[PDB]
Amino acid sequence: GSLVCVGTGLQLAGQISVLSRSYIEHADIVFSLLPDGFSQRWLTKLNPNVINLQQFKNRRDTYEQMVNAILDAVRAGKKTVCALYGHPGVFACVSHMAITRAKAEGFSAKMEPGISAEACLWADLGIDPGNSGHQSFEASQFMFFNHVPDPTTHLLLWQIAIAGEHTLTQFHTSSDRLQILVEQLNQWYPLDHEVVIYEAANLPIQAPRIERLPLANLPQAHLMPISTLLIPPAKKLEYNYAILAKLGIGPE
Amino acid sequence: GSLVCVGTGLQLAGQISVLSRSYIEHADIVFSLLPDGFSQRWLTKLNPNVINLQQFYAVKNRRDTYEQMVNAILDAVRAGKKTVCALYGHPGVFACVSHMAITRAKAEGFSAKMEPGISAEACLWADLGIDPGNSGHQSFEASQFMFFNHVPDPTTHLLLWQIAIAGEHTLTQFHTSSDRLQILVEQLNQWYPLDHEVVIYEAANLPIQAPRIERLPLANLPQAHLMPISTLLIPPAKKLEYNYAILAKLGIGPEDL
Amino acid sequence: LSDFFTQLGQDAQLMEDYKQNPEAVMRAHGLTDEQINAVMTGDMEKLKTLS
Amino acid sequence: GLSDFFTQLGQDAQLMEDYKQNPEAVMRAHGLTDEQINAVMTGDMEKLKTLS
Ligand SMILES: [Zn+2]
């Protein structure tokens, strides 16, 4: 048995690497975890032997039954291939878990890179991150932990739709959660600061969503699972005189 | 006609979108800018009508070479040719030519888009098996991280790109690579100990070739042999700490999430 | 319908032909006006039934 | 010849798996010289650009 986790991307059918697609064709069994059903049908016509994991209660126990099911196949000695949405190693626990436990059982397990929502964002917004630089955080993690963003460079917040996802103790709406985030970002960015709600197109007949709005209107915004918030810089660059001095450049 | 830039990823042949590959197949003309010749042949067999843009290079300033590269592409678009540009990795990440060609194409009113592809970063995550959404992720251009003020969050993975030419300027040439690197080490020492393990990464081109993954202490960085595509990965130095403040509002504790 | 979105997402030729003449190309595969309308309108939700 | 191989290896998952199981045999079945197989197996990339 063996495990190989591949990514389909955001677009349908067309946004998967030639190789990753080959893995699905030659897989003895495939474990799908895609959003829409158009993607689900496609996969099937790509390989008849497909086990949908959506069939599988806390997320702790859901992924435990998922991983367990994937392994069973690998333990039986079937060349297993796990097809996930976008990139199989980006905001994806099932893969890292499965690979980890397969490595722990001596089985061969790896992961092929695919196109993440971020890779799409750069193209759709004609942004080159290489020159500009960027930062990425899971919205929730950015709330529950101490993350100090650099407001001179782009800031992406993934899974902004489920930001503040936690166990129930008090009654808060999503807008209440988003309002807290807005307050927390206010430590660096003003309320009138323009942000962008990006949503990668799934279907080739659909265009990506690129809504701009002040940070203050985020709570009211209607968000989606795959929604990501882009927070462009709000502070100007400054010379790093310290390091410039060392390099040989000072007042010049 | 139209312009469409596509990325071939890093790996040869197999690390490209099914659609992007289709574009190269059903295109009147194709302008290429790929690394090795194995990749150049691959493209040829995929479409015989290929113009290699490596020829526009040298003595000439880069912005001049690009000017020509870009003009050559528009010449095809203006001519009414369904043009496709085949770039390495992601056609938008570290790609002045694509953005220039697309911007200028759009200006003249030509239909022009950019299809996303697999970047070196996309590979870095899979190769090392690191999930950026785990502890976060920060990317900077080394030189830009040295020239300008960028305070990194040492709870996240920090990526410094183009580490080979880190600090390269006309007024810094009197320094050797080892020197500039040393200066970068002194800077990072502010957040990262000298013993901290860092990783130099380079994605593979050929399927029989492996990605460079050299683990070493930050201190031995100045000695390390770097490559133009080389990138530095500084893993976290501190474990994330809860925002007990924000946890207070939602009325939960660390044990509830 | 599903086959069309699949071909349209993979085939760069069909991709372009679509932008040349959306409606006509969708006929060429065989979609009703109600669908073509939902595609042209922009109601993704609409397509939750023609599927 | 050698170029056709690398191209196939990069895009076929089956062939990719086979290679990593039995590099030599697989290369032999695609008619590579013993020198090519060697260069590949020693990872001498300069000598492949020699034998192209
Ligand atoms: Zn990133």
β-strands A108-111, A2-7 pairing = parallel
Q: Does A34 touch chain C (CB under 8 A)?
A: no
Long-range CB pairs of B97-100 (<8 Å, 24+ gap) are B97/B33, B97/B53, B97/B66, B97/B69, B97/B70, B97/B73, B98/B5, B99/A126, B99/A128, B100/B66, B100/B70
Alpha-carbon separation of residue B245 from A144, A145, A218, A219, B250 (angstroms): 9, 9, 21, 20, 9
Say what angle helices A18-26 and D13-21 make with each other, to 10 degrees: 80
Question: Which residue, chain included where needed, has tokens 């279907």?
Answer: A203
Cα distance between the two ends of chain B: 54
Which phi and psi (to 5°) does residue D36 adopt? Answer: -60, -50
Q: Say how many C-beta atoms besides its own lie within 10 A of residue B32's C-beta.
A: 21
Task: Give the best residue of B16, B19, B113 to mutate against chain C (max C CB count within 10 A).
Answer: B19
Q: Chain B to chain D, count of Cβ pairs less than 8 Å apart?
A: 40
* Interatomic CA distance for residues D13 and A201, integer angstroms: 28
Catalytic residues of B, by residue number, are: 62, 66, 88
Q: Which two tokens stand for residue A46?
A: 């790509």
- The one-letter code for the residue type at A248 is G
Reduce the DSSP state of residue A80 to 3 states and report it: strand
* Interatomic CA distance for residues A204 and B192, integer angstroms: 45
* Interatomic CA distance for residues B112 and B110, integer angstroms: 6
Alpha-carbon separation of residue B88 from A26, A46, A159, A172, B15 (angstroms): 27, 28, 29, 47, 10
* Interatomic CA distance for residues B190 and B65, integer angstroms: 39
Reduce the DSSP state of residue B161 to 3 states and report it: strand
* Interatomic CA distance for residues B23 and B8, integer angstroms: 12
* Interatomic CA distance for residues B54 and A237, integer angstroms: 34
Annotated catalytic residue A21: no
Measured in angstroms, the CA of B187 and the nearest CA of chain C are apart by 47
Determination technique used: X-ray
User: Are A237 and A209 a contacting pair, CB within 8 Å?
Assistant: no
Indicate which residue of A21, A41, A59, A189 is catalytic: A59
* Interatomic CA distance for residues A217 and A198, integer angstroms: 15
Q: Is the dihedral of CA A31, A34, A38, A42 positive or negative?
A: negative
PDB resolution in Å:
2.7
Q: Counting every residue, how long is chain C?
A: 51
CB contact set of B173 (below 8 Å; sequence gap of 6+):
none
Q: State the number of CA atoms in the 13 A half-sphere of B249 facing the CB.
A: 16
Domain boundaries in chain D? Answer: 2-42
Q: Which two tokens stand for residue B68?
A: 């020509």
Q: Do chains C and D touch (3 or more CB pairs under 8 A)?
A: no
Closest CA to C2 of C41, C42, C33, C48: C48
User: Are A189 and A234 a contacting pair, CB within 8 Å?
Assistant: yes
Closest CA to A94 of A57, A56, A40: A56
The secondary structure element, H or E, covering residue D46 is: none
Question: Which residue, chain included where needed, has tokens 């690579």?
Answer: B177
- The one-letter code for the residue type at B137 is H
* Partners of A80 in the β-ladder: A3, A29
Q: Is the dihedral of CA D20, D24, D30, D34 positive or negative?
A: positive
Closest CA to B163 of B225, B99, B110: B225
Closest residue in A to B136 (Cα–Cα): A137
Alpha-carbon separation of residue A86 from A16, A20, A114, A168, B115 (angstroms): 8, 12, 6, 30, 14
